[PDB]
Amino acid sequence: TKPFSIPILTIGEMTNSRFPLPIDMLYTSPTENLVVQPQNGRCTTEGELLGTTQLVTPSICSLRGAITGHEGNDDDHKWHMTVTSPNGAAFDPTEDVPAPLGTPDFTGDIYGVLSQRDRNINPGQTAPANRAHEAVVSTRSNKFTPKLGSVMIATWETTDVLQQPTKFTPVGLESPNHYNQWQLPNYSGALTLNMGLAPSVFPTYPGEQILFFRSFIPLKGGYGNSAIDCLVPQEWIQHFYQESAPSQTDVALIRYVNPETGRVLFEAKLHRQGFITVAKTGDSPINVPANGYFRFDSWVNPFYSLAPM
Amino acid sequence: TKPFSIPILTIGEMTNSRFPLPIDMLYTSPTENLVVQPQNGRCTTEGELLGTTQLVTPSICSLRGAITGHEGNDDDHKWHMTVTSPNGAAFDPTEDVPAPLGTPDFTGDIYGVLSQRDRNINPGQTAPANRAHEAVVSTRSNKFTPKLGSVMIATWETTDVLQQPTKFTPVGLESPNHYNQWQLPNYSGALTLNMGLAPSVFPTYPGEQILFFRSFIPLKGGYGNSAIDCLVPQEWIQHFYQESAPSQTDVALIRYVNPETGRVLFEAKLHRQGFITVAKTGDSPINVPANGYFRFDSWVNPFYSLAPM
């Protein structure tokens, strides 16, 4: 029975699993009136990846493939991007997954860079031509259809985008308008429901809330202090995936500890499904030292009563 | 005496430690005419970080701080960025490091996005304003002085940059002009030498070359198939940092294994200083399965004779 374990990296040493950003703080909040069902950042404590989760940090909310033309006829700023899997191989729309690995899992206008490196070398050259432009992938568009193998990608530039291999590097959001981090996009477009989903997560013990790892997400414009929350850091996913330690119950009692002073600061439940709950109500700040990290202490039963945070 | 170990993640599951990119291939080449002295991606096999190396993947080649105004009075595209440490805290120019952690470690015109979130809320508003623009940090500029707490950052945008907290998210290179991945920038500007450096690395056993983890790096324009090479993946750095396993000799014999068939494909030396050498000459392609990873097998004496790849 290989023992379960969690990384000893601090908050300040880890990366958000739902967007390639540093983790700025721990954060909790009531979620009784919404459905927390992210598809990136999903891993069981036994190392099973779920949803669209993959292990390469800069590929989170990235897209890869080629531009094949404009999307439609009536907007010169809109391009049809046929997408592949991150490894460059064809994606099978009938695969029992929501969309290609690392596809964005929220509703919003994602800002980043469209770059291209030509597949062919021109006469008189020794190397392929390149170009890049700022761009937006609107996951609420009816042409956001990654499960079918394509997305519409928009530019402010209106001509210098070729029918060439294309990558989208995510940077942030175009604005806070229409951003809802817990609303899954329609991976197959309009009037088609999503499939292959990692399940929703929620606390059940009275007075518990989900604990999130929160990152502030850049905005291209608008007023806001937008953030995106993940259930576990990307480094925890990489760790569980490698360790594949059996879970002895469905609940791991974990403690947040200051390694210098040895002081345990609070306790929490790491659920087998891959999320944390704490005995906390409200959204007030979580005040913890910088050198702190979670330590696995024991497997407990569903009803273990946590010390209130 | 804690045993040394290497992650079991495959090349296609890890990240470049010198730029936030997936790893595309293993790569070797002669370096007899170069000085290989990167400052990101530097970790001893005992977990000692060196140079400018830090653990947050999207912070590699990033810069944080605030714009104070234009750089000079003659180009409204050029801005003076005061730089902080990645945690937002003041950087001390006298600390025994080359530059703030994560600072770029090569010569080139680094392309990315400059984003800002205002520090105050304006009257009539409830949230701070935001803006972001394509930007270039030229590390060959005499105004690239991160060890002194500032860099010049340029935007195609001419005015919509304020004197506000600022992040630079790296995406790729503006072009291949003057890109030299092994030429350190002058962290303190002109006529001042760098200090606090992680040491240069080179093979010494006859017929050995350095083995690199190679990523293709996007280009905003120009002709080229530009790449950037790191000495070990970012996930190896995170692993060694946490494990802190003592190094029993200066050289770890490691084997690239196919986990499925269990077959060992080739062998290599992981040096305590934190780089890999192999018995290979030239730059011809390294042909290995997708599911392959390096496994630590034993500690060996200096000048151990490897099987030729």
UniProtKB/TrEMBL annotation, chains A, B:
Keywords per UniProt:
Host cytoplasm, Virion
**Spans through the membrane:** none
A single Gene Ontology CC term: virion component
Species of provenance: Norovirus GII
Q: Which residues form the Calicivirus coat protein C-terminal domain?
A: 84-309
This protein's name: VP1
- Subcellular localization(s) per the UniProt record: Host cytoplasm; Virion
